[PDB]
Amino acid sequence: LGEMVTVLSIDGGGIRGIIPATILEFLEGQLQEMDNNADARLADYFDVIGGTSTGGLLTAMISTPNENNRPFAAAKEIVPFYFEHGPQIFNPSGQILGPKYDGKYLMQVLQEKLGETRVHQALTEVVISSFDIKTNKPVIFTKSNLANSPELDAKMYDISYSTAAAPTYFPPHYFVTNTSNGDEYEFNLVDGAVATVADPALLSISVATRLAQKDPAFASIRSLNYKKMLLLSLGTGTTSEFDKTYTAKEAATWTAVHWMLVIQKMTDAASSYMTDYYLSTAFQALDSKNNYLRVQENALTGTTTEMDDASEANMELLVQVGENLLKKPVSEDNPETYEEALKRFAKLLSDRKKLRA
């Protein structure tokens, strides 16, 4: 168990980020109780912490060092963050030409809570996604892969704004770093969901697998041995309820405007289903299905669907969805609930740390 690699992955979902945050508040509290340490943080138990958009914001806030070289935010401080800053991040600009939001508040609160910290300072391996619209390539921010190409040692707020810079919602982000030669290196980044990874769990598994080639602490998964891998992937919920879906017939006359307000939700939903299929296939092939815990909501209803509904009523509903998810079964045939599976996971995390110490 001591040689096992631990990976945490958080999906994007806008305001639906309350759901994995509620899930992480429960898990961090389990670890704090078991280890008799109220200062116990997720970055102390996870080797890799991956996140896209709001999952990336979360990743950055629990990986960035504070004044004590401790993770900046506790898991229980994330739903209050979403409740406090969510209505101001998701406050419409009112402008006719451009995105729904100016991104001014989102950047300001990120700057405020992340400071001048760089990715090389992360307390664990981070995997925060984006897509560069100038190089037309995904740009994945890691603590590793910095030895080669130091121009990726970007500010945590530039990484965090970029991962969440959703086309039509917020404007793309432009920022500069410096290469080894001292010359400028340009970034023109949009949301990580564009880079096809709304669900960054497979990307996070690949980063760990690639690190296993150059790091002895990751050596146990060196030849795809996911038997020696613990993966916690967290979703922001999907929906199949006919009230919130569409027919091919009604969509026959849909213009470019209607599609744009709906494709991100579709690709993000598809990203969840495909990445889960890839990972289940791989873990079930090695007879290690329980090494991969995917905490996801499949029946979002009402306002709970929308990514930018930062009203008090929708935020309270998202908490309720998160708290009901804990009592919901892991599978259709498995009676084991998520709260129970998360206790088993916390125990494994707790036991691996002790042995490594």
CSV table of N, CA and C in Angstrom, one decimal, residues 38-196:
chain,number,residue,atom,x,y,z
A,38,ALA,N,-6.6,18.5,13.1
A,38,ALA,CA,-7.5,19.5,12.5
A,38,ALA,C,-6.9,20.3,11.4
A,39,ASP,N,-5.6,20.3,11.3
A,39,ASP,CA,-4.9,21.0,10.2
A,39,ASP,C,-4.6,20.0,9.0
A,40,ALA,N,-5.1,18.7,9.1
A,40,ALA,CA,-5.0,17.8,7.9
A,40,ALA,C,-5.6,18.4,6.7
A,41,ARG,N,-4.9,18.4,5.6
A,41,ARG,CA,-5.3,18.9,4.3
A,41,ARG,C,-5.2,17.8,3.2
A,42,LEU,N,-6.0,18.0,2.1
A,42,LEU,CA,-6.0,17.0,1.0
A,42,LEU,C,-4.6,16.9,0.3
A,43,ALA,N,-3.9,18.0,0.2
A,43,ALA,CA,-2.6,18.0,-0.4
A,43,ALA,C,-1.5,17.2,0.4
A,44,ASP,N,-1.8,16.9,1.6
A,44,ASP,CA,-1.0,16.1,2.5
A,44,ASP,C,-1.1,14.6,2.1
A,45,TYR,N,-2.3,14.2,1.5
A,45,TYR,CA,-2.6,12.8,1.2
A,45,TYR,C,-2.6,12.5,-0.3
A,46,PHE,N,-2.6,13.5,-1.2
A,46,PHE,CA,-2.7,13.3,-2.6
A,46,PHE,C,-1.4,13.7,-3.3
A,47,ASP,N,-0.9,12.8,-4.2
A,47,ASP,CA,0.4,13.1,-4.9
A,47,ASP,C,0.1,14.1,-6.1
A,48,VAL,N,-1.0,13.8,-6.8
A,48,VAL,CA,-1.5,14.6,-7.9
A,48,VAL,C,-2.9,15.2,-7.5
A,49,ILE,N,-3.1,16.5,-7.8
A,49,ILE,CA,-4.4,17.1,-7.7
A,49,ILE,C,-4.7,17.7,-9.0
A,50,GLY,N,-5.6,17.2,-9.8
A,50,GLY,CA,-6.1,17.7,-11.1
A,50,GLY,C,-7.4,18.3,-11.0
A,51,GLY,N,-7.6,19.4,-11.9
A,51,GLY,CA,-8.8,20.2,-12.0
A,51,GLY,C,-8.9,21.0,-13.2
A,52,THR,N,-10.1,21.2,-13.7
A,52,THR,CA,-10.5,22.0,-14.9
A,52,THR,C,-11.5,23.0,-14.4
A,53,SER,N,-11.4,24.3,-14.9
A,53,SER,CA,-12.3,25.4,-14.6
A,53,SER,C,-12.5,25.6,-13.1
A,54,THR,N,-13.7,25.5,-12.6
A,54,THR,CA,-13.9,25.6,-11.1
A,54,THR,C,-13.2,24.5,-10.3
A,55,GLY,N,-13.0,23.3,-10.9
A,55,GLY,CA,-12.3,22.2,-10.4
A,55,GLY,C,-10.8,22.6,-10.3
A,56,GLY,N,-10.3,23.4,-11.2
A,56,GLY,CA,-9.0,24.0,-11.3
A,56,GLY,C,-8.8,25.1,-10.2
A,57,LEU,N,-9.8,25.9,-10.0
A,57,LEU,CA,-9.8,27.0,-9.0
A,57,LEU,C,-9.6,26.3,-7.6
A,58,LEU,N,-10.4,25.3,-7.4
A,58,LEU,CA,-10.4,24.5,-6.1
A,58,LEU,C,-9.0,23.9,-6.0
A,59,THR,N,-8.4,23.2,-7.0
A,59,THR,CA,-7.1,22.6,-7.1
A,59,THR,C,-6.1,23.7,-6.6
A,60,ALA,N,-6.1,24.9,-7.2
A,60,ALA,CA,-5.2,26.0,-6.9
A,60,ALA,C,-5.3,26.5,-5.4
A,61,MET,N,-6.5,26.5,-4.9
A,61,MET,CA,-6.7,27.0,-3.5
A,61,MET,C,-6.3,26.1,-2.5
A,62,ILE,N,-6.3,24.7,-2.8
A,62,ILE,CA,-5.9,23.7,-1.8
A,62,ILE,C,-4.5,23.2,-2.0
A,63,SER,N,-3.7,23.8,-3.0
A,63,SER,CA,-2.4,23.4,-3.4
A,63,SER,C,-1.4,24.5,-3.1
A,64,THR,N,-1.8,25.8,-3.2
A,64,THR,CA,-1.0,27.0,-3.1
A,64,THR,C,-0.6,27.1,-1.6
A,65,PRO,N,0.7,27.3,-1.3
A,65,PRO,CA,1.2,27.5,0.0
A,65,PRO,C,0.8,28.9,0.6
A,66,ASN,N,0.5,28.9,1.9
A,66,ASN,CA,0.2,30.1,2.7
A,66,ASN,C,1.4,30.5,3.4
A,67,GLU,N,1.3,31.5,4.4
A,67,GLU,CA,2.4,32.0,5.2
A,67,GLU,C,3.1,30.9,6.0
A,68,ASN,N,2.4,29.8,6.3
A,68,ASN,CA,3.0,28.7,7.1
A,68,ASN,C,3.5,27.6,6.2
A,69,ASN,N,3.5,27.8,4.9
A,69,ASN,CA,3.8,26.8,3.9
A,69,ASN,C,2.9,25.6,4.0
A,70,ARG,N,1.6,25.9,4.2
A,70,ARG,CA,0.5,25.0,4.4
A,70,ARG,C,-0.6,25.3,3.3
A,71,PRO,N,-1.4,24.4,2.9
A,71,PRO,CA,-2.4,24.7,1.8
A,71,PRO,C,-3.3,25.9,2.2
A,72,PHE,N,-3.4,26.8,1.3
A,72,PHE,CA,-4.1,28.1,1.4
A,72,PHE,C,-5.5,27.9,2.0
A,73,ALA,N,-6.3,27.0,1.5
A,73,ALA,CA,-7.6,26.8,1.9
A,73,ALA,C,-7.9,25.4,2.4
A,74,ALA,N,-8.7,25.3,3.4
A,74,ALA,CA,-9.3,24.0,3.9
A,74,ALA,C,-10.4,23.6,3.0
A,75,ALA,N,-10.7,22.3,2.9
A,75,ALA,CA,-11.8,21.9,2.0
A,75,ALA,C,-13.2,22.5,2.5
A,76,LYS,N,-13.4,22.7,3.8
A,76,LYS,CA,-14.6,23.3,4.3
A,76,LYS,C,-14.8,24.8,4.0
A,77,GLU,N,-13.7,25.5,3.5
A,77,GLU,CA,-13.7,26.9,3.2
A,77,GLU,C,-14.1,27.1,1.7
A,78,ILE,N,-14.3,26.1,0.9
A,78,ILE,CA,-14.6,26.1,-0.5
A,78,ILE,C,-16.1,26.5,-0.8
A,79,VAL,N,-17.1,25.8,-0.1
A,79,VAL,CA,-18.5,26.1,-0.3
A,79,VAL,C,-18.7,27.6,0.2
A,80,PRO,N,-18.2,28.0,1.4
A,80,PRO,CA,-18.3,29.5,1.7
A,80,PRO,C,-17.7,30.4,0.6
A,81,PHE,N,-16.6,30.0,0.0
A,81,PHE,CA,-16.0,30.8,-1.1
A,81,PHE,C,-17.0,30.9,-2.2
A,82,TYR,N,-17.6,29.8,-2.7
A,82,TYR,CA,-18.6,29.8,-3.8
A,82,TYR,C,-19.8,30.6,-3.4
A,83,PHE,N,-20.2,30.6,-2.1
A,83,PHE,CA,-21.4,31.4,-1.6
A,83,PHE,C,-21.1,32.8,-1.5
A,84,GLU,N,-19.8,33.2,-1.1
A,84,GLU,CA,-19.4,34.6,-1.0
A,84,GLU,C,-19.1,35.3,-2.3
A,85,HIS,N,-18.3,34.7,-3.2
A,85,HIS,CA,-17.8,35.3,-4.4
A,85,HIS,C,-18.5,34.8,-5.7
A,86,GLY,N,-19.2,33.7,-5.6
A,86,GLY,CA,-20.0,33.1,-6.7
A,86,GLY,C,-21.0,34.1,-7.3
A,87,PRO,N,-21.8,34.9,-6.4
A,87,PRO,CA,-22.8,35.8,-7.0
A,87,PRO,C,-22.1,37.0,-7.7
A,88,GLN,N,-20.8,37.3,-7.3
A,88,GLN,CA,-20.0,38.5,-7.9
A,88,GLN,C,-19.2,38.0,-9.1
A,89,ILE,N,-18.7,36.8,-9.1
A,89,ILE,CA,-18.0,36.2,-10.2
A,89,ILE,C,-19.1,36.1,-11.4
A,90,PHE,N,-20.3,35.6,-11.1
A,90,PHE,CA,-21.4,35.4,-12.0
A,90,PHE,C,-22.4,36.5,-11.9
A,91,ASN,N,-21.9,37.7,-12.1
A,91,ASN,CA,-22.7,39.0,-12.1
A,91,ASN,C,-22.6,39.5,-13.5
A,92,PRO,N,-23.7,39.6,-14.3
A,92,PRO,CA,-23.6,40.0,-15.8
A,92,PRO,C,-23.1,41.4,-16.0
A,93,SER,N,-22.1,41.6,-16.9
A,93,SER,CA,-21.6,42.9,-17.3
A,93,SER,C,-22.6,43.8,-17.9
A,94,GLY,N,-23.5,43.2,-18.7
A,94,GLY,CA,-24.6,43.9,-19.4
A,94,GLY,C,-24.2,44.3,-20.8
A,95,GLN,N,-22.9,44.2,-21.2
A,95,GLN,CA,-22.4,44.6,-22.5
A,95,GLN,C,-23.0,43.7,-23.6
A,96,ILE,N,-23.3,44.3,-24.8
A,96,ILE,CA,-23.9,43.6,-25.9
A,96,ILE,C,-22.8,42.8,-26.7
A,97,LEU,N,-21.6,43.4,-27.0
A,97,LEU,CA,-20.6,42.6,-27.8
A,97,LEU,C,-19.6,42.0,-26.8
A,98,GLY,N,-19.6,40.6,-26.8
A,98,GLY,CA,-18.7,39.9,-26.0
A,98,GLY,C,-19.3,38.9,-25.1
A,99,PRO,N,-18.6,38.5,-24.0
A,99,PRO,CA,-19.1,37.5,-23.1
A,99,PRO,C,-20.1,38.0,-22.0
A,100,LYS,N,-20.8,37.0,-21.4
A,100,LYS,CA,-21.8,37.3,-20.4
A,100,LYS,C,-21.2,38.0,-19.2
A,101,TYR,N,-20.0,37.7,-18.8
A,101,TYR,CA,-19.2,38.3,-17.7
A,101,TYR,C,-17.9,38.9,-18.2
A,102,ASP,N,-17.5,40.0,-17.5
A,102,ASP,CA,-16.2,40.7,-17.9
A,102,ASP,C,-15.0,40.0,-17.3
A,103,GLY,N,-15.2,39.0,-16.4
A,103,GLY,CA,-14.1,38.3,-15.8
A,103,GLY,C,-13.3,39.1,-14.8
A,104,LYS,N,-13.6,40.4,-14.6
A,104,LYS,CA,-13.0,41.4,-13.7
A,104,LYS,C,-13.0,40.9,-12.3
A,105,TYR,N,-14.2,40.5,-11.7
A,105,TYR,CA,-14.3,40.0,-10.4
A,105,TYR,C,-13.5,38.7,-10.2
A,106,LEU,N,-13.7,37.8,-11.2
A,106,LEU,CA,-13.0,36.4,-11.1
A,106,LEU,C,-11.5,36.6,-11.0
A,107,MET,N,-10.9,37.4,-11.8
A,107,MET,CA,-9.5,37.7,-11.7
A,107,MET,C,-9.0,38.4,-10.4
A,108,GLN,N,-9.8,39.4,-9.9
A,108,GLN,CA,-9.5,40.1,-8.7
A,108,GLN,C,-9.5,39.2,-7.5
A,109,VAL,N,-10.6,38.4,-7.3
A,109,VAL,CA,-10.7,37.5,-6.1
A,109,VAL,C,-9.6,36.4,-6.3
A,110,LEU,N,-9.2,35.9,-7.5
A,110,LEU,CA,-8.1,34.9,-7.7
A,110,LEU,C,-6.8,35.6,-7.3
A,111,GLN,N,-6.5,36.8,-7.8
A,111,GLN,CA,-5.3,37.6,-7.4
A,111,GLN,C,-5.3,37.7,-5.9
A,112,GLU,N,-6.4,38.1,-5.3
A,112,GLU,CA,-6.5,38.4,-3.8
A,112,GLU,C,-6.1,37.1,-3.0
A,113,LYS,N,-6.7,36.0,-3.3
A,113,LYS,CA,-6.5,34.7,-2.6
A,113,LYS,C,-5.3,33.9,-3.0
A,114,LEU,N,-4.7,34.2,-4.2
A,114,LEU,CA,-3.5,33.4,-4.6
A,114,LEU,C,-2.2,34.2,-4.5
A,115,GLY,N,-2.3,35.5,-4.5
A,115,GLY,CA,-1.2,36.4,-4.4
A,115,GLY,C,-0.3,36.3,-5.6
A,116,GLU,N,1.0,36.3,-5.4
A,116,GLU,CA,2.1,36.3,-6.4
A,116,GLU,C,2.7,34.9,-6.6
A,117,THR,N,2.0,33.9,-6.0
A,117,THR,CA,2.5,32.5,-6.0
A,117,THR,C,2.5,32.0,-7.4
A,118,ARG,N,3.5,31.1,-7.7
A,118,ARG,CA,3.8,30.4,-9.0
A,118,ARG,C,3.5,29.0,-8.8
A,119,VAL,N,3.3,28.2,-9.9
A,119,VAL,CA,2.9,26.8,-9.9
A,119,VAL,C,4.1,25.9,-9.3
A,120,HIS,N,5.4,26.4,-9.4
A,120,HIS,CA,6.5,25.6,-8.9
A,120,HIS,C,6.4,25.5,-7.3
A,121,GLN,N,5.6,26.4,-6.7
A,121,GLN,CA,5.5,26.4,-5.2
A,121,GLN,C,4.4,25.5,-4.7
A,122,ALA,N,3.5,24.8,-5.6
A,122,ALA,CA,2.4,24.0,-5.2
A,122,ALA,C,2.9,22.9,-4.3
A,123,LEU,N,2.1,22.6,-3.2
A,123,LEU,CA,2.5,21.7,-2.2
A,123,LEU,C,2.4,20.2,-2.6
A,124,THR,N,1.8,20.0,-3.8
A,124,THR,CA,1.7,18.7,-4.4
A,124,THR,C,1.7,18.9,-5.9
A,125,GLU,N,1.7,17.8,-6.7
A,125,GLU,CA,1.6,17.8,-8.2
A,125,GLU,C,0.3,18.3,-8.6
A,126,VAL,N,0.2,19.4,-9.4
A,126,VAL,CA,-1.0,20.0,-9.8
A,126,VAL,C,-1.2,19.8,-11.3
A,127,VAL,N,-2.4,19.6,-11.8
A,127,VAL,CA,-2.7,19.4,-13.2
A,127,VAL,C,-3.9,20.3,-13.5
A,128,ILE,N,-3.7,21.6,-13.9
A,128,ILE,CA,-4.7,22.5,-14.2
A,128,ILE,C,-4.7,22.8,-15.7
A,129,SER,N,-5.8,22.5,-16.4
A,129,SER,CA,-6.0,22.6,-17.8
A,129,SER,C,-6.4,23.9,-18.4
A,130,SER,N,-6.1,24.1,-19.7
A,130,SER,CA,-6.4,25.2,-20.5
A,130,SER,C,-6.2,24.9,-22.0
A,131,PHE,N,-6.7,25.8,-22.9
A,131,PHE,CA,-6.5,25.6,-24.3
A,131,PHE,C,-6.0,27.0,-24.8
A,132,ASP,N,-4.9,27.0,-25.6
A,132,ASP,CA,-4.3,28.2,-26.1
A,132,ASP,C,-4.8,28.4,-27.5
A,133,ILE,N,-5.6,29.5,-27.7
A,133,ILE,CA,-6.3,29.8,-29.0
A,133,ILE,C,-5.3,30.4,-30.0
A,134,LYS,N,-4.0,30.7,-29.7
A,134,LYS,CA,-3.0,31.3,-30.6
A,134,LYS,C,-2.0,30.2,-31.1
A,135,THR,N,-1.7,29.2,-30.3
A,135,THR,CA,-0.9,28.1,-30.6
A,135,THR,C,-1.8,26.9,-31.0
A,136,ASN,N,-3.2,27.1,-30.7
A,136,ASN,CA,-4.2,26.1,-31.0
A,136,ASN,C,-3.9,24.7,-30.4
A,137,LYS,N,-3.4,24.8,-29.2
A,137,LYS,CA,-3.0,23.6,-28.4
A,137,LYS,C,-3.4,23.6,-27.0
A,138,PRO,N,-3.8,22.5,-26.4
A,138,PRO,CA,-4.0,22.5,-24.9
A,138,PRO,C,-2.8,22.9,-24.2
A,139,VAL,N,-2.9,23.6,-23.1
A,139,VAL,CA,-1.8,24.0,-22.2
A,139,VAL,C,-2.1,23.5,-20.8
A,140,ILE,N,-1.4,22.5,-20.4
A,140,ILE,CA,-1.5,21.8,-19.1
A,140,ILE,C,-0.4,22.3,-18.2
A,141,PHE,N,-0.9,22.9,-17.0
A,141,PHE,CA,0.0,23.4,-16.0
A,141,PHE,C,0.3,22.4,-14.9
A,142,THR,N,1.6,22.0,-14.8
A,142,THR,CA,2.1,21.1,-13.8
A,142,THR,C,3.3,21.6,-13.1
A,143,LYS,N,3.5,21.1,-11.9
A,143,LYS,CA,4.7,21.5,-11.0
A,143,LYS,C,5.9,20.9,-11.6
A,144,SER,N,5.8,19.6,-12.1
A,144,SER,CA,6.8,18.9,-12.8
A,144,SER,C,6.8,19.4,-14.2
A,145,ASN,N,7.6,18.8,-15.1
A,145,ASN,CA,7.7,19.3,-16.5
A,145,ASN,C,8.1,20.8,-16.6
A,146,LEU,N,8.6,21.3,-15.5
A,146,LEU,CA,9.1,22.7,-15.3
A,146,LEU,C,10.6,22.7,-15.5
A,147,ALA,N,11.3,21.6,-15.2
A,147,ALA,CA,12.7,21.4,-15.3
A,147,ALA,C,13.1,21.8,-16.7
A,148,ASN,N,12.4,21.1,-17.6
A,148,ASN,CA,12.4,21.3,-19.1
A,148,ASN,C,11.3,22.3,-19.3
A,149,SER,N,11.6,23.4,-20.0
A,149,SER,CA,10.7,24.5,-20.3
A,149,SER,C,10.2,25.3,-19.1
A,150,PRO,N,11.0,26.2,-18.5
A,150,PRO,CA,10.6,27.0,-17.3
A,150,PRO,C,9.6,28.1,-17.6
A,151,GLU,N,9.2,28.3,-18.9
A,151,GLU,CA,8.2,29.3,-19.3
A,151,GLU,C,6.8,28.9,-18.8
A,152,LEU,N,6.6,27.7,-18.3
A,152,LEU,CA,5.3,27.3,-17.8
A,152,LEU,C,5.1,27.5,-16.3
A,153,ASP,N,6.1,28.2,-15.7
A,153,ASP,CA,6.0,28.6,-14.3
A,153,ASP,C,5.2,29.9,-14.2
A,154,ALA,N,3.9,29.8,-14.5
A,154,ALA,CA,3.0,30.9,-14.5
A,154,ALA,C,2.4,31.1,-13.1
A,155,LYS,N,1.9,32.4,-12.9
A,155,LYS,CA,1.2,32.8,-11.7
A,155,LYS,C,0.0,31.9,-11.5
A,156,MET,N,-0.4,31.6,-10.2
A,156,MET,CA,-1.5,30.7,-9.9
A,156,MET,C,-2.8,31.4,-10.3
A,157,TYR,N,-2.9,32.8,-10.3
A,157,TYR,CA,-4.1,33.5,-10.7
A,157,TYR,C,-4.3,33.5,-12.2
A,158,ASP,N,-3.2,33.5,-13.0
A,158,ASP,CA,-3.3,33.5,-14.5
A,158,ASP,C,-3.7,32.1,-14.9
A,159,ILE,N,-3.2,31.0,-14.3
A,159,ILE,CA,-3.6,29.6,-14.5
A,159,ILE,C,-5.0,29.4,-14.2
A,160,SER,N,-5.5,29.8,-13.0
A,160,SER,CA,-6.8,29.7,-12.4
A,160,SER,C,-7.9,30.5,-13.2
A,161,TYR,N,-7.6,31.7,-13.6
A,161,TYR,CA,-8.5,32.5,-14.4
A,161,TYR,C,-8.7,31.8,-15.8
A,162,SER,N,-7.6,31.4,-16.4
A,162,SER,CA,-7.5,30.7,-17.7
A,162,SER,C,-8.3,29.4,-17.8
A,163,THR,N,-8.1,28.5,-16.7
A,163,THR,CA,-8.8,27.3,-16.7
A,163,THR,C,-10.3,27.4,-16.7
A,164,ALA,N,-10.8,28.6,-16.1
A,164,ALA,CA,-12.3,28.9,-16.0
A,164,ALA,C,-12.7,29.9,-17.1
A,165,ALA,N,-11.8,30.4,-17.9
A,165,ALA,CA,-12.2,31.4,-18.9
A,165,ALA,C,-13.0,30.7,-20.0
A,166,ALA,N,-14.3,30.5,-19.7
A,166,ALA,CA,-15.2,29.8,-20.6
A,166,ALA,C,-15.7,30.7,-21.7
A,167,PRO,N,-15.5,30.3,-23.0
A,167,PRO,CA,-16.0,31.1,-24.2
A,167,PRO,C,-17.5,31.4,-24.0
A,168,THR,N,-17.9,32.7,-24.3
A,168,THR,CA,-19.3,33.2,-24.2
A,168,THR,C,-19.6,33.6,-22.7
A,169,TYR,N,-18.9,33.0,-21.7
A,169,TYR,CA,-19.1,33.3,-20.3
A,169,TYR,C,-18.1,34.4,-19.9
A,170,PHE,N,-16.8,34.2,-20.1
A,170,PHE,CA,-15.7,35.1,-19.7
A,170,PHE,C,-14.8,35.4,-20.9
A,171,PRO,N,-14.1,36.5,-21.0
A,171,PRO,CA,-13.1,36.7,-22.1
A,171,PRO,C,-11.9,35.9,-22.0
A,172,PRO,N,-11.2,35.5,-23.1
A,172,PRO,CA,-10.0,34.7,-23.0
A,172,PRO,C,-8.9,35.5,-22.3
A,173,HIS,N,-7.9,34.8,-21.7
A,173,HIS,CA,-6.9,35.5,-20.9
A,173,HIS,C,-5.5,35.5,-21.7
A,174,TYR,N,-4.9,36.6,-21.6
A,174,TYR,CA,-3.6,36.9,-22.2
A,174,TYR,C,-2.6,37.2,-21.0
A,175,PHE,N,-1.4,36.5,-21.0
A,175,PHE,CA,-0.4,36.7,-20.0
A,175,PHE,C,1.0,36.2,-20.5
A,176,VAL,N,2.0,36.8,-19.9
A,176,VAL,CA,3.4,36.5,-20.3
A,176,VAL,C,4.3,36.0,-19.1
A,177,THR,N,5.1,35.0,-19.5
A,177,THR,CA,6.2,34.5,-18.6
A,177,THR,C,7.5,34.6,-19.4
A,178,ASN,N,8.6,34.1,-18.9
A,178,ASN,CA,9.9,34.2,-19.6
A,178,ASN,C,10.6,32.8,-19.7
A,179,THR,N,11.1,32.5,-20.9
A,179,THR,CA,11.8,31.3,-21.2
A,179,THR,C,13.2,31.3,-20.4
A,180,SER,N,13.9,30.2,-20.5
A,180,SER,CA,15.3,30.0,-19.9
A,180,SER,C,16.3,31.1,-20.5
A,181,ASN,N,16.1,31.5,-21.7
A,181,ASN,CA,16.9,32.5,-22.4
A,181,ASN,C,16.6,34.0,-22.0
A,182,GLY,N,15.5,34.1,-21.1
A,182,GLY,CA,15.1,35.4,-20.6
A,182,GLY,C,14.1,36.2,-21.5
A,183,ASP,N,13.8,35.7,-22.7
A,183,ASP,CA,12.8,36.3,-23.6
A,183,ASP,C,11.4,35.9,-23.2
A,184,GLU,N,10.4,36.7,-23.6
A,184,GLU,CA,9.0,36.6,-23.3
A,184,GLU,C,8.3,35.3,-23.9
A,185,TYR,N,7.4,34.7,-23.2
A,185,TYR,CA,6.6,33.6,-23.6
A,185,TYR,C,5.2,33.9,-23.3
A,186,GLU,N,4.4,34.0,-24.4
A,186,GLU,CA,3.0,34.4,-24.5
A,186,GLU,C,2.0,33.3,-24.3
A,187,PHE,N,0.9,33.6,-23.6
A,187,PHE,CA,-0.3,32.7,-23.3
A,187,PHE,C,-1.6,33.4,-23.7
A,188,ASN,N,-2.4,32.8,-24.5
A,188,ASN,CA,-3.7,33.2,-25.0
A,188,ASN,C,-4.7,32.1,-24.7
A,189,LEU,N,-5.1,32.0,-23.4
A,189,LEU,CA,-5.9,30.9,-22.9
A,189,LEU,C,-7.4,31.0,-22.7
A,190,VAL,N,-8.1,30.0,-23.0
A,190,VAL,CA,-9.5,29.8,-22.7
A,190,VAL,C,-9.7,28.5,-21.8
A,191,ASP,N,-10.9,28.3,-21.3
A,191,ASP,CA,-11.3,27.2,-20.4
A,191,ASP,C,-10.7,25.9,-20.8
A,192,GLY,N,-10.4,25.1,-19.8
A,192,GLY,CA,-9.8,23.7,-19.9
A,192,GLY,C,-10.8,22.7,-20.6
A,193,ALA,N,-12.1,23.0,-20.5
A,193,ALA,CA,-13.2,22.2,-21.1
A,193,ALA,C,-13.0,22.2,-22.6
A,194,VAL,N,-12.5,23.3,-23.2
A,194,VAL,CA,-12.2,23.4,-24.7
A,194,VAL,C,-11.1,22.4,-25.0
A,195,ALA,N,-10.1,22.2,-24.1
A,195,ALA,CA,-9.1,21.2,-24.3
A,195,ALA,C,-9.6,19.8,-24.2
A,196,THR,N,-10.9,19.6,-24.2
A,196,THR,CA,-11.7,18.3,-24.2
A,196,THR,C,-11.7,17.7,-22.8
